[PDB]
Design a protein around this ligand. Structure first.
Ligand SMILES: CC(C)CCC[C@@H](C)[C@H]1CC[C@H]2[C@@H]3CC=C4C[C@@H](OC(=O)CCC(=O)O)CC[C@]4(C)[C@H]3CC[C@]12C
Ligand SMILES: CC(C)CCC[C@@H](C)[C@H]1CC[C@H]2[C@@H]3CC=C4C[C@@H](OC(=O)CCC(=O)O)CC[C@]4(C)[C@H]3CC[C@]12C
Ligand SMILES: CCCCCCCCCCCCCC
Ligand SMILES: CCCCCCCCCCCCCC
Ligand SMILES: CCCCCCCCCCCCCC
Ligand SMILES: CCCCCCCCCCCCCC
Lengths: 51, 51
């Protein structure tokens, strides 16, 4: 909420205050931190099949 | 009118903008400009009665 009667002010002020939400930022962080292990697991699986 | 949701802001802003209304200021001005002639008329009337 904001103290004003100007239409559209709340939208822009919220957008400026929070360019991105914390929760979605953390979701991106965890996905990025997790991808390399998945890649390594897939590589090991295929190498084991070839061996 | 003012652009705000704050209660009491319109009252104080109007008071600050207009310490006194123009019309009442002009009424005071004309009364002050007119009183001396009335005083002079009364003085002349009483002097004429005495004479
Ligand atoms: C936590 C670990 C120790 C056990 C749980 C994960 C495993 C079951 C993972 C490791 C590597 C994964 C594999 C790596 C790559 C592929 C991609 C994918 O390949 C495809 O068939 C894609 C479709 C296509 O080939 O057209 C199918 C799943 C599979 C076999 C994965 C199945 C799940 C595996 C075996
Ligand atoms: C524009 C001019 C040329 C004509 C129109 C105004 C006159 C009629 C004025 C001039 C002086 C005035 C007088 C000045 C003083 C007094 C005050 C007042 O005296 C009282 O009797 C007060 C009460 C009391 O004595 O206890 C009565 C009106 C009177 C006679 C005024 C009546 C009206 C007068 C005559
Ligand atoms: C103007 C606002 C700039 C803010 C940009 C934030 C970028 C966030 C990137 C998240 C992914 C890493
Ligand atoms: C929606 C609430 C958050 C749930 C966790 C986000 C998903 C986590 C995925 C795990 C990493 C996947 C690597 C590709
Ligand atoms: C503080 C505001 C000050 C404004 C005072 C205005 C006085 C007006 C006087 C009118 C009578 C002559
Ligand atoms: C209320 C609208 C304004 C009317 C004029 C104001 C009164 C003028 C009085 C005349 C002077 C009197 C001298 C004592």
């Amino acid at each position: 909420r904001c103290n004003t009667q100007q239409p559209g002010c709340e939208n822009v002020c919220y957008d400026k205050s929070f360019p991105i939400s914390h929760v979605r930022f953390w979701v991106l962080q965890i996905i990025f931190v997790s991808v390399p292990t998945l890649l390594y697991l897939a590589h090991v699986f295929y190498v084991m099949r070839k061996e």
